[PDB]
Amino acid sequence: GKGAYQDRDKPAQIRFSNISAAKAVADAIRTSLGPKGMDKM
Amino acid sequence: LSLAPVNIFKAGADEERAETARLTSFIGAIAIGDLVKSTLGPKGMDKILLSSGRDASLMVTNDGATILKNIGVDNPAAKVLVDMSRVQDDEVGDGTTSVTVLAAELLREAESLIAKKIHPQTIIAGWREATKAAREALLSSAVDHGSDEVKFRQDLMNIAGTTLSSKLLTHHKDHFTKLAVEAVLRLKGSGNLEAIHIIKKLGGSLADSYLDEGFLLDKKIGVNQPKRIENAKILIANTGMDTDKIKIFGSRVRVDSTAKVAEIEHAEKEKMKEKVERILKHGINCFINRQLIYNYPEQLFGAAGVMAIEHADFAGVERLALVTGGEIASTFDHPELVKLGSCKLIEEVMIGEDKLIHFSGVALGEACTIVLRGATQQILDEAERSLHDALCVLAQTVKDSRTVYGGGCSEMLMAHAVTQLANRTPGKEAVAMESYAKALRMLPTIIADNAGYDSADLVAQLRAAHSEGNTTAGLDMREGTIGDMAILGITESFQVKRQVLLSAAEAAEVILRVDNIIKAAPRKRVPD
Ligand SMILES: Nc1ncnc2c1ncn2[C@@H]1O[C@H](COP(=O)(O)OP(=O)(O)O)[C@@H](O)[C@H]1O
Ligand SMILES: Nc1ncnc2c1ncn2[C@@H]1O[C@H](COP(=O)(O)OP(=O)(O)O)[C@@H](O)[C@H]1O
Numbered sequence A: 001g002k003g004a005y006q007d008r009d010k011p012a013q014i015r016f017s018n019i020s021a022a023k024a025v026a027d028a029i030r031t032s033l034g035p036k037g038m039d040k041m
Numbered sequence B: 001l002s003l004a005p006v007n008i009f010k011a012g013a014d015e016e017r018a019e020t021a022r023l024t025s026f027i028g029a030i031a032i033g034d035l036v037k038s039t040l041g042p043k044g045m046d047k048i049l050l051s052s053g054r055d056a057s058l059m060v061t062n063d064g065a066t067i068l069k070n071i072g073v074d075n076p077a078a079k080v081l082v083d084m085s086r087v088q089d090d091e092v093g094d095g096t097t098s099v100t101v102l103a104a105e106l107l108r109e110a111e112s113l114i115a116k117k118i119h120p121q122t123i124i125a126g127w128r129e130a131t132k133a134a135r136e137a138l139l140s141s142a143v144d145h146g147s148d149e150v151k152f153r154q155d156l157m158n159i160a161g162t163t164l165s166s167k168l169l170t171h172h173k174d175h176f177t178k179l180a181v182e183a184v185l186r187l188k189g190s191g192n193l194e195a196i197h198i199i200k201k202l203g204g205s206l207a208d209s210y211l212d213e214g215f216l217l218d219k220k221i222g223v224n225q226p227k228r229i230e231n232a233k234i235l236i237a238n239t240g241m242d243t244d245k246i247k248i249f250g251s252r253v254r255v256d257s258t259a260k261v262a263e264i265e266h267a268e269k270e271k272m273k274e275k276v277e278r279i280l281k282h283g284i285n286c287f288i289n290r291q292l293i294y295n296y297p298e299q300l301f302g303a304a305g306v307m308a309i310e311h312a313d314f315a316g317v318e319r320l321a322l323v324t325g326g327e328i329a330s331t332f333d334h335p336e337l338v339k340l341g342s343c344k345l346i347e348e349v350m351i352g353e354d355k356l357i358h359f360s361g362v363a364l365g366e367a368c369t370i371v372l373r374g375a376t377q378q379i380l381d382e383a384e385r386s387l388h389d390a391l392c393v394l395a396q397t398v399k400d401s402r403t404v405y406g407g408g409c410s411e412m413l414m415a416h417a418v419t420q421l422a423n424r425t426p427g428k429e430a431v432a433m434e435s436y437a438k439a440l441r442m443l444p445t446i447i448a449d450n451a452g453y454d455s456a457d458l459v460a461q462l463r464a465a466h467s468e469g470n471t472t473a474g475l476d477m478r479e480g481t482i483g484d485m486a487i488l489g490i491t492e493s494f495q496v497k498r499q500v501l502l503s504a505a506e507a508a509e510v511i512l513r514v515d516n517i518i519k520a521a522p523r524k525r526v527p528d
């Protein structure tokens, strides 16, 4: 069986653009965490 | 060489003739039904709407009525399908996605018929005999209930668990079905859906929502007034305690000494004392007002041990007269012609970080409140929006109690009635009737297409099972096979399916008759 062709790439490129936006915010505040995290001004 | 040598119109006004107007009206309508198709069925996806000028208000929704009301379209023929979608939401509250897809599939099949050199008036006259033969075969297939309580309750549970399916609430379907069916039975047959107050607030999971037994109010009590009183006697009033009764005339004070002003000032302060003493003759301990209460009468209630609740709008006073059972009172001259409310315990509760007044133990209980808890602000908005679709469709089943098997069984049922009619009528209308039966069979196709199943094989199995006798066969979306609808419990409302055919056949008739689009000169916007 080889059916179920996916002819639309919009949902794939949008789901991947949500991952990179959320992963980028988590990388921003990674430094300020724990007893030895610094401060942002 | 141009559009007539003479100039009739002004500068900026446009006209479209027959061959190009049908091109605009047919690509405008298909575009609307293509954006919305992705949100159809138990496994439909979800969209995001960002505003560019409204302070960037991010809202996330699924229903096909709030999406169309927000998308700004300039196509003349696409504005008809946005208007008809709003009327569906304001009539029955469910079926907006299905009414736009169906009316957009009828137009797609009407463009290949014009290319066969068929007059538009032939298609329209052929479709009228198709809608009539379709609504007769749906009425005959309805199951009328309501003579048994144990059967009617099971019909309302199946309807509620079918509407909540495409919505975000489908994760906790077993919990939100009981909150949606018990809140409708509290109305005791009154179609007043405003009596259900949905209070939403941040914090907590979606599984922490509940339906409160009594009532909840987001107001505050006066200073140093009792927080709790057991066995209360509530009096609901709407009277002006602001400053004093202004006594509207054109009056003024014209005394000639400053001691006479002090005597009149003491006359106002004894006017409000008399009004308060006339309230206490009822023998109450809970006064509720819909306007403000100032600092003088606030201490008079607190010295006799009376709870005063001030600033409760019409939404919170009309509801409290149906819960406890009192009446909205004024003029305070006859304590024997008034009826007081009743409760059993009134306390202050802590939901998150706010305080609300709780009403535990009630007489009637004809109105209620639902507490929604969620992680984000978009989940709270979507839970409220989805829950409103479950309450609206359960208020129609009680007035008109007859249900139609859903999940694809109803669409194939009406499509078979048109096919048997199209094999009888001679002429060109046999071609136009088949297009109507072709557009009804794509609604089950889209449902199976979103789930990734073999749609071209399931429709063939359904069409072959509906022409031999099996009138309850339909799609089974939990496995991917064909299953019965009277066993699994996929049920819809008769009024919802009836309003879809009639609305989607009129909008395809108005649009199809258009052969000339005339645009006036747009109003310009001042830049500076
Ligand atoms: N003295 C400590 N030694 C090791 N770990 C710590 C100490 N104090 C706090 N933590 C840990 O650091 C984690 C994160 O804390 P922090 O980043 O300061 O604030 P937040 O809990 O809001 O992220 C906590 O889960 C805690 O277990
Ligand atoms: N559990 C289910 N199994 C099969 N079909 C379903 C189920 N739940 C809903 N449907 C079908 O999905 C269709 C669309 O419903 P939905 O997208 O939730 O709202 P709307 O009717 O406004 O499009 C309905 O016609 C219904 O028959």
Ligand SMILES: [Mg+2]
Pocket: B094, B095, B163
């Ligand atoms: Mg629905």
